[PDB]
């Protein structure tokens, strides 16, 4: 599933 | 050129509008990110995670309570409204308009927007940690224990509310602890929502990006999809672009957007 902010 | 944009606007039969923090900013909603966006000691990064909540759910709720309460005085700005009215007007003509928003303040809802996708959830929904039920909730205060709490003063005393008195699930058998139905750092988006948005963006024939830019998360998950079909993309935000440069209208969405959609 997609990490919010891409997890950055 | 604006006229050029409006020529598309006029033809477009399925518009998707993606909205970011810029638009909530213009209504005076704090983002809590970067310069001077502190809440007491902390910034959002610090508190908006499952670990913070496991560790100190009183503190996290104090934070989110505050955010719920400050919405009582922030209103939708003209951008919010100019959208909602556009959706209404066009729907009457059998033309669709959907909002895909990264904002969790329900401002689009309060403006009168109907077909809205809240991809980071909403300050005015809860989720039961135990049973997973998602309820709307606008109660001020969300529970008595929090009444008059969550002051933002750096020096405010922690309310150190016992967990049992924080918001709880109402389904009598359950009584689980509620959390804000908001996507925290280190969590995924709801794939059902993403799949719907995917569907909407495939349908669309004009895309607007507002109070954020296509290069950045989360506009960047999508605009690639729409643009690669040859669909026009218009940004409305406060970032510059270089001398030598899909339209861009620099300035406050409050000003730029309503002329665009009239
Ligand atoms: C993630 O950034 C999350 C909500 C989406 C930004 C409006 C952090 C928060 O504000 O709880
Ligand atoms: Zn429950």
Tab-separated table of C-alpha atoms and ligand atoms in Angstrom:
chain	number	residue	atom	x	y	z
A	1	UNK	CA	0.000	0.000	0.000
A	2	UNK	CA	1.196	3.470	-0.595
A	3	UNK	CA	3.159	5.164	2.111
A	4	UNK	CA	2.108	8.732	2.591
A	5	UNK	CA	4.883	11.147	1.451
A	6	UNK	CA	6.322	7.931	-0.052
A	7	UNK	CA	7.612	7.447	3.542
A	8	UNK	CA	10.400	10.024	2.991
B	1	UNK	CA	-2.775	32.236	-20.956
B	2	UNK	CA	-6.153	32.188	-19.188
B	3	UNK	CA	-8.422	32.294	-22.245
B	4	UNK	CA	-6.552	29.264	-23.476
B	5	UNK	CA	-7.379	27.497	-20.243
B	6	UNK	CA	-11.038	28.514	-20.410
B	7	UNK	CA	-11.351	27.083	-23.914
B	8	UNK	CA	-10.555	23.740	-22.333
B	9	UNK	CA	-12.732	24.404	-19.337
B	10	UNK	CA	-15.647	25.023	-21.727
B	11	UNK	CA	-15.243	21.695	-23.505
B	12	UNK	CA	-14.355	19.549	-20.524
B	13	UNK	CA	-16.954	16.957	-19.545
B	14	UNK	CA	-15.177	15.241	-16.620
B	15	UNK	CA	-12.954	17.419	-14.481
B	16	UNK	CA	-10.833	16.203	-11.651
B	17	UNK	CA	-9.478	18.674	-9.153
B	18	UNK	CA	-6.673	17.745	-6.837
B	19	UNK	CA	-6.269	19.906	-3.777
B	20	UNK	CA	-3.408	20.361	-1.341
B	21	UNK	CA	-2.471	22.306	1.752
B	22	UNK	CA	-2.273	25.622	-0.051
B	23	UNK	CA	-6.031	25.874	-0.080
B	24	UNK	CA	-6.456	25.065	3.607
B	25	UNK	CA	-3.664	27.527	4.331
B	26	UNK	CA	-5.671	30.341	2.722
B	27	UNK	CA	-8.483	29.638	5.168
B	28	UNK	CA	-5.973	30.027	7.980
B	29	UNK	CA	-5.675	26.338	8.832
B	30	UNK	CA	-2.309	25.439	10.288
B	31	UNK	CA	-0.399	22.563	8.565
B	32	UNK	CA	2.160	22.202	11.406
B	33	UNK	CA	4.998	21.599	8.922
B	34	UNK	CA	8.299	23.426	8.486
B	35	UNK	CA	9.006	26.998	9.760
B	36	UNK	CA	7.025	28.108	12.821
B	37	UNK	CA	4.480	25.300	12.454
B	38	UNK	CA	5.012	23.991	16.004
B	39	UNK	CA	2.374	22.706	18.422
B	40	UNK	CA	3.783	23.106	21.872
B	41	UNK	CA	7.209	21.383	21.639
B	42	UNK	CA	6.329	19.270	18.654
B	43	UNK	CA	5.676	19.305	14.941
B	44	UNK	CA	3.277	17.060	13.009
B	45	UNK	CA	6.033	14.627	12.020
B	46	UNK	CA	6.481	13.988	15.765
B	47	UNK	CA	2.858	13.351	16.764
B	48	UNK	CA	1.072	12.065	13.721
B	49	UNK	CA	2.322	8.423	13.925
B	50	UNK	CA	1.068	5.126	15.326
B	51	UNK	CA	4.006	5.041	17.756
B	52	UNK	CA	3.218	8.424	19.254
B	53	UNK	CA	-0.373	7.231	19.720
B	54	UNK	CA	0.590	3.919	21.261
B	55	UNK	CA	3.016	5.763	23.524
B	56	UNK	CA	0.955	8.779	24.482
B	57	UNK	CA	-2.620	8.785	23.200
B	58	UNK	CA	-3.592	11.619	25.601
B	59	UNK	CA	-1.001	13.855	24.040
B	60	UNK	CA	-1.921	12.922	20.483
B	61	UNK	CA	-5.627	13.509	21.207
B	62	UNK	CA	-4.846	16.844	22.823
B	63	UNK	CA	-3.202	17.712	19.489
B	64	UNK	CA	-6.028	16.505	17.317
B	65	UNK	CA	-8.687	18.051	19.644
B	66	UNK	CA	-7.027	21.414	19.148
B	67	UNK	CA	-7.132	20.944	15.407
B	68	UNK	CA	-10.818	20.017	15.513
B	69	UNK	CA	-11.544	23.117	17.650
B	70	UNK	CA	-9.671	25.623	15.529
B	71	UNK	CA	-11.922	24.651	12.598
B	72	UNK	CA	-14.887	26.274	14.298
B	73	UNK	CA	-13.465	29.711	13.212
B	74	UNK	CA	-11.805	28.926	9.878
B	75	UNK	CA	-14.195	29.139	6.989
B	76	UNK	CA	-13.924	27.980	3.423
B	77	UNK	CA	-12.275	30.596	1.199
B	78	UNK	CA	-13.364	31.559	-2.309
B	79	UNK	CA	-11.345	28.705	-3.806
B	80	UNK	CA	-13.380	26.158	-1.878
B	81	UNK	CA	-16.578	27.825	-2.888
B	82	UNK	CA	-15.724	28.446	-6.492
B	83	UNK	CA	-15.079	24.733	-6.774
B	84	UNK	CA	-18.270	23.604	-5.016
B	85	UNK	CA	-20.422	25.909	-7.095
B	86	UNK	CA	-18.693	24.784	-10.259
B	87	UNK	CA	-19.440	21.147	-9.425
B	88	UNK	CA	-23.070	22.070	-8.887
B	89	UNK	CA	-23.424	24.111	-12.044
B	90	UNK	CA	-21.750	21.509	-14.228
B	91	UNK	CA	-23.602	18.537	-12.726
B	92	UNK	CA	-26.768	20.262	-13.802
B	93	UNK	CA	-25.371	20.127	-17.313
B	94	UNK	CA	-24.486	16.405	-16.991
B	95	UNK	CA	-20.769	17.283	-16.578
B	96	UNK	CA	-18.862	15.835	-13.640
B	97	UNK	CA	-16.439	17.411	-11.159
B	98	UNK	CA	-14.612	15.466	-8.479
B	99	UNK	CA	-12.284	16.591	-5.763
B	100	UNK	CA	-9.370	14.530	-4.610
B	101	UNK	CA	-7.970	16.216	-1.553
B	102	UNK	CA	-4.988	15.662	0.683
B	103	UNK	CA	-6.611	17.925	3.268
B	104	UNK	CA	-8.406	16.574	6.307
B	105	UNK	CA	-10.313	19.690	7.435
B	106	UNK	CA	-13.597	19.030	5.632
B	107	UNK	CA	-13.492	22.556	4.168
B	108	UNK	CA	-14.613	21.324	0.745
B	109	UNK	CA	-17.605	19.697	2.415
B	110	UNK	CA	-18.530	22.882	4.170
B	111	UNK	CA	-18.208	24.749	0.872
B	112	UNK	CA	-20.851	22.461	-0.591
B	113	UNK	CA	-18.667	20.073	-2.577
B	114	UNK	CA	-20.230	16.606	-2.901
B	115	UNK	CA	-18.013	14.264	-4.903
B	116	UNK	CA	-14.934	14.490	-2.707
B	117	UNK	CA	-12.219	11.927	-2.058
B	118	UNK	CA	-10.391	12.454	1.300
B	119	UNK	CA	-7.266	10.438	0.787
B	120	UNK	CA	-5.750	11.286	4.114
B	121	UNK	CA	-9.001	10.860	5.987
B	122	UNK	CA	-10.648	13.572	8.121
B	123	UNK	CA	-10.319	15.268	11.509
B	124	UNK	CA	-14.074	14.750	11.917
B	125	UNK	CA	-14.112	11.008	11.659
B	126	UNK	CA	-12.947	8.445	14.184
B	127	UNK	CA	-11.856	4.860	13.901
B	128	UNK	CA	-12.264	2.303	16.659
B	129	UNK	CA	-8.962	0.667	17.468
B	130	UNK	CA	-10.799	-2.473	18.437
B	131	UNK	CA	-13.620	-2.929	15.928
B	132	UNK	CA	-12.470	-0.653	13.083
B	133	UNK	CA	-15.805	1.212	12.752
B	134	UNK	CA	-15.634	4.620	11.117
B	135	UNK	CA	-18.036	7.262	12.425
B	136	UNK	CA	-18.413	10.895	11.643
B	137	UNK	CA	-17.985	13.010	14.733
B	138	UNK	CA	-18.105	16.813	15.105
B	139	UNK	CA	-18.778	16.954	18.872
B	140	UNK	CA	-17.066	19.886	20.540
B	141	UNK	CA	-15.495	18.638	22.667
B	142	UNK	CA	-15.244	15.119	21.263
B	143	UNK	CA	-15.314	13.844	24.854
B	144	UNK	CA	-15.636	15.635	28.235
B	145	UNK	CA	-12.106	14.756	29.397
B	146	UNK	CA	-10.733	16.956	26.605
B	147	UNK	CA	-12.907	19.965	27.311
B	148	UNK	CA	-10.730	23.057	27.331
B	149	UNK	CA	-7.598	20.998	26.600
B	150	UNK	CA	-4.970	20.945	23.860
B	151	UNK	CA	-3.717	24.505	24.236
B	152	UNK	CA	-0.812	25.160	21.853
B	153	UNK	CA	1.336	27.206	24.250
B	154	UNK	CA	4.838	25.679	24.250
B	155	UNK	CA	4.555	25.677	28.083
B	156	UNK	CA	1.151	24.059	28.486
B	157	UNK	CA	0.849	21.273	31.095
B	158	UNK	CA	0.184	17.856	29.577
B	159	UNK	CA	-3.389	16.788	30.322
B	160	UNK	CA	-2.250	13.191	30.923
B	161	UNK	CA	-5.826	11.913	30.478
B	162	UNK	CA	-6.239	8.238	31.329
B	163	UNK	CA	-6.925	6.114	28.253
B	164	UNK	CA	-10.312	4.874	29.509
B	165	UNK	CA	-11.604	8.483	29.388
B	166	UNK	CA	-10.313	9.374	25.951
B	167	UNK	CA	-12.895	8.952	23.183
B	168	UNK	CA	-14.358	5.474	23.162
B	169	UNK	CA	-16.443	3.447	20.734
B	170	UNK	CA	-20.161	3.582	21.391
B	171	UNK	CA	-21.044	0.037	20.374
B	172	UNK	CA	-21.693	-1.133	23.941
B	173	UNK	CA	-20.014	-4.529	23.606
B	174	UNK	CA	-16.850	-2.885	22.202
B	175	UNK	CA	-15.840	0.326	23.989
B	176	UNK	CA	-12.594	0.371	22.087
B	177	UNK	CA	-10.350	3.431	22.059
B	178	UNK	CA	-10.992	5.717	19.138
B	179	UNK	CA	-8.318	7.271	16.984
B	180	UNK	CA	-8.647	10.016	14.386
B	181	UNK	CA	-9.458	8.568	11.000
B	182	UNK	CA	-6.455	10.260	9.496
B	183	UNK	CA	-3.576	8.746	7.669
B	184	UNK	CA	-0.429	9.043	9.821
B	185	UNK	CA	3.223	8.879	8.821
B	186	UNK	CA	4.243	5.310	8.231
B	187	UNK	CA	0.660	4.211	7.262
B	188	UNK	CA	-0.764	3.322	3.841
B	189	UNK	CA	-3.565	4.917	1.889
B	190	UNK	CA	-6.859	2.978	1.652
B	191	UNK	CA	-6.501	1.075	-1.655
B	192	UNK	CA	-10.234	1.180	-2.286
B	193	UNK	CA	-9.994	4.938	-2.403
B	194	UNK	CA	-6.931	4.820	-4.660
B	195	UNK	CA	-8.760	2.513	-7.013
B	196	UNK	CA	-11.701	4.843	-7.238
B	197	UNK	CA	-9.417	7.805	-7.800
B	198	UNK	CA	-7.583	5.853	-10.477
B	199	UNK	CA	-10.930	5.251	-12.150
B	200	UNK	CA	-11.889	8.945	-11.880
B	201	UNK	CA	-8.547	10.144	-13.302
B	202	UNK	CA	-8.766	7.790	-16.232
B	203	UNK	CA	-12.219	9.277	-17.033
B	204	UNK	CA	-11.158	12.864	-16.752
B	205	UNK	CA	-10.446	15.268	-19.638
B	206	UNK	CA	-9.072	18.204	-17.690
B	207	UNK	CA	-7.203	18.092	-14.395
B	208	UNK	CA	-6.615	20.901	-11.914
B	209	UNK	CA	-3.938	20.976	-9.248
B	210	UNK	CA	-4.562	23.461	-6.448
B	211	UNK	CA	-2.500	24.590	-3.492
B	212	UNK	CA	0.258	22.050	-4.347
B	213	UNK	CA	2.120	21.005	-7.548
B	214	UNK	CA	2.179	17.986	-9.833
B	215	UNK	CA	5.862	17.261	-9.066
B	216	UNK	CA	5.230	16.526	-5.436
B	217	UNK	CA	3.333	13.992	-3.340
B	218	UNK	CA	0.525	13.295	-3.737
B	219	UNK	CA	-0.249	14.998	-7.033
B	220	UNK	CA	2.654	13.003	-8.437
B	221	UNK	CA	0.965	9.623	-8.052
B	222	UNK	CA	-1.567	10.643	-10.645
B	223	UNK	CA	-0.819	13.558	-12.990
B	224	UNK	CA	1.537	11.169	-14.769
B	225	UNK	CA	-1.516	8.985	-15.531
B	226	UNK	CA	-3.664	11.852	-16.797
B	227	UNK	CA	-0.880	13.710	-18.665
B	228	UNK	CA	0.313	10.583	-20.482
B	229	UNK	CA	-3.187	10.396	-21.986
B	230	UNK	CA	-2.657	13.910	-23.386
B	231	UNK	CA	-5.072	15.602	-20.960
B	232	UNK	CA	-4.420	19.230	-19.933
B	233	UNK	CA	-3.254	19.950	-16.388
B	234	UNK	CA	-3.522	23.365	-14.735
B	235	UNK	CA	-1.786	24.243	-11.494
B	236	UNK	CA	-2.925	27.016	-9.167
B	237	UNK	CA	-0.413	27.660	-6.395
B	238	UNK	CA	2.192	30.090	-5.028
B	239	UNK	CA	5.329	28.496	-6.400
B	240	UNK	CA	7.272	30.227	-9.162
B	241	UNK	CA	8.344	28.552	-12.372
B	242	UNK	CA	11.452	29.587	-14.454
B	243	UNK	CA	11.589	32.165	-17.272
B	244	UNK	CA	11.640	29.404	-19.896
B	245	UNK	CA	8.386	27.607	-19.206
B	246	UNK	CA	-0.066	22.349	-18.929
B	247	UNK	CA	-0.788	25.807	-17.457
B	248	UNK	CA	0.335	27.550	-14.277
B	249	UNK	CA	-1.397	30.362	-12.461
B	250	UNK	CA	0.820	31.734	-9.772
B	251	UNK	CA	-0.893	33.337	-6.813
B	252	UNK	CA	-3.510	32.679	-4.076
B	253	UNK	CA	-6.160	30.151	-5.081
B	254	UNK	CA	-8.633	32.522	-3.399
B	255	UNK	CA	-7.956	35.019	-6.231
B	256	UNK	CA	-6.748	32.949	-9.140
B	257	UNK	CA	-9.348	30.207	-9.125
B	258	UNK	CA	-12.779	31.843	-9.141
B	259	UNK	CA	-12.239	33.850	-12.308
B	260	UNK	CA	-10.969	30.592	-13.854
B	261	UNK	CA	-14.155	28.635	-13.078
B	262	UNK	CA	-16.918	31.275	-13.562
C	1	LIG	C1	-0.178	13.607	7.101
C	1	LIG	O1	0.547	14.511	6.715
C	1	LIG	C2	-1.277	13.837	8.094
C	1	LIG	C3	-2.530	14.515	7.460
C	1	LIG	C4	-2.387	14.876	5.963
C	1	LIG	C5	-1.800	16.301	5.899
C	1	LIG	C6	-2.966	17.318	5.899
C	1	LIG	C7	-0.551	14.530	9.257
C	1	LIG	C8	-1.604	15.213	10.102
C	1	LIG	O2	-1.789	16.420	9.868
C	1	LIG	O3	-2.199	14.524	10.950
C	2	LIG	ZN1	-15.607	-0.385	18.367
